Design a protein around this ligand. Structure first.
Ligand SMILES: C[S@@+](CC[C@H](N)C(=O)[O-])C[C@H]1O[C@@H](n2cnc3c(N)ncnc32)[C@H](O)[C@@H]1O
Ligand SMILES: [Cl-]
Ligand SMILES: [Zn+2]
Ligand SMILES: [Zn+2]
Lengths: 301, 116
């Protein structure tokens, strides 16, 4: 439809309010591939459409913004998604990325290793994850909530996402976590966004917009994922690369959103309102310091 | 006294007919930019492609030290504009060419400082 000229399709609200049972994901357009512009990689196209969609939300965009990107390496040993994020984000935005395997990157700093080894002294305004293990795509076994790096991501959000910040976390039919959906109820708004270039995949980005640090809504994550699959199962999305050809309004506007440091006792309804509108970030404004835990072993003799 | 000469090695490899380094990260952009060589955001004009800088750097891509004595990289974290006719080998292009320190275009691919 007219959806084909959008960067992708967000989960309609009515599907979010259902109580479906989890079924297998059977996509009508399965196997089809979008025609990408000449020489453009899928992950560049995909991140571009993700960023085009995020431009339509009420993201907080402060000065001295801090973004961290998990799962940023490719099997090519480069970081196409990080390159798009850096293009999108205002110049000077502090960008850190990470992956299990070594890769070369345009980020300001890159940590190599299991994400659970990553620690940061500071809080973040935006968290992007493309972390994924293709071995989860096992149609012969039950599709249960997954732990692994999702357990890390849930804790990291609750501990290190600034109030007002946002996240975009890649999931698929089999790569998902019930607590992560439940955590989407701690943002002013949330959705599951499917890029039009990859619409034949059960992939989506779970987007939490403007973190409130407490539940606005109680979400059962097993039911929500079933709701997501029901939507995908019943709403074929036409593969489309159209939005890639209009880049004039791509850059994220440097809103200069205010940053304040506040203690949990000071977060009143008026603060919560400002957080909910993309008008306020709550965190310290100190230096950005990160580290990766390294396991040491001497296997000699 | 001994240090590997990766630049010479890549030049000789290309002259002997080797396939250019691939998977340089090409960006989507308007292609209405300034055309300067190395920029904080993609600046390709109609005659250029913009690439993520690190992916077009021989030293980054080969996991070797940079020539700069402090080991700094001119490309990492920026975007490099490559003439469309040379976009089949962005690494070779960035290695073989030099940026005009006055106007910021590639010498011989946009720099007109030596014409007034
Ligand atoms: C879809 S790919 C990365 C694509 C990349 N974002 C890009 O821009 O092209 C999935 C990534 O998740 C990473 N990954 C998966 N599990 C991980 C874990 N437990 N810790 C860290 N990285 C992980 C993989 O190494 C892999 O590079
Ligand atoms: Cl629910
Ligand atoms: Zn380099
Ligand atoms: Zn010049």
């Amino acid at each position: 439809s007219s959806q084909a000229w959008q960067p992708g399709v967000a989960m309609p609200n009515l599907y979010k309010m259902q109580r479906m049972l989890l079924e297998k994901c059977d996509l009508q357009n399965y196997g089809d591939s979008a025609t990408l512009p000449k020489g453009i990689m899928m992950n560049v196209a995909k991140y571009t459409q993700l960023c085009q969609y995020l431009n339509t939300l009420t993201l907080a965009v402060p000065y001295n913004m801090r973004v961290i990107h998990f799962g940023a390496g490719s099997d090519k040993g480069v970081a196409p998604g990080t390159a798009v994020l850096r293009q999108w984000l205002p110049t000077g935005t502090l960008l850190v990325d990470s992956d299990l395997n070594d890769f070369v990157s345009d980020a300001d700093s890159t940590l190599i290793g299991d994400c659970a080894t990553v620690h940061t002294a500071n809080k973040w305004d935006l968290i992007i994850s493309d972390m994924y293990d293709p071995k989860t795509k096992n149609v012969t076994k039950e599709n249960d909530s997954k732990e692994g790096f999702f357990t890390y991501i849930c804790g990291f959000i609750q501990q290190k996402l600034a109030l007002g910040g946002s996240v975009a976390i890649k999931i698929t039919e089999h790569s998902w976590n019930a607590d992560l959906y439940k955590l989407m109820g701690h943002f002013a708004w949330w959705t599951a966004f499917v890029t039009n270039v990859n619409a034949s995949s059960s992939e989506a980005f779970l987007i939490g917009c403007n973190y409130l640090g407490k539940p606005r809504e109680q979400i059962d994550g097993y039911v929500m994922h079933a709701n997501y699959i029901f939507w995908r199962n019943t709403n074929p999305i036409q593969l489309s690369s159209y939005s890639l050809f209009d880049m004039s309004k791509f850059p994220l506007k440097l809103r200069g959103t205010a940053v304040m440091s506040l203690k949990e006792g000071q977060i009143n309804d008026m603060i919560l309102s400002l957080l909910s509108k993309g008008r306020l970030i709550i965190r310290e404004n100190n230096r950005v310091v990160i580290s990766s835990d390294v396991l040491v072993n001497n296997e000699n003799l | 006294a001994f240090a590997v000469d990766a630049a010479k090695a890549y030049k000789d490899y290309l002259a002997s007919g080797g396939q250019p380094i691939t998977n340089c990260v090409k960006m989507l952009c308007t292609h209405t930019g300034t055309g300067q060589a190395i920029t904080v955001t993609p600046e390709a004009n109609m005659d250029q492609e913009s690439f993520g800088g690190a992916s077009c750097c021989l030293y980054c891509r080969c996991h070797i030290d940079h020539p700069n004595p402090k080991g700094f990289c001119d490309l990492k974290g920026k975007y490099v504009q490559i003439p469309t006719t040379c976009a089949n080998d962005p690494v070779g292009f960035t290695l073989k060419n030099t940026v005009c320190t006055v106007c910021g275009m590639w010498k011989g691919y946009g720099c007109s400082c030596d014409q007034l």
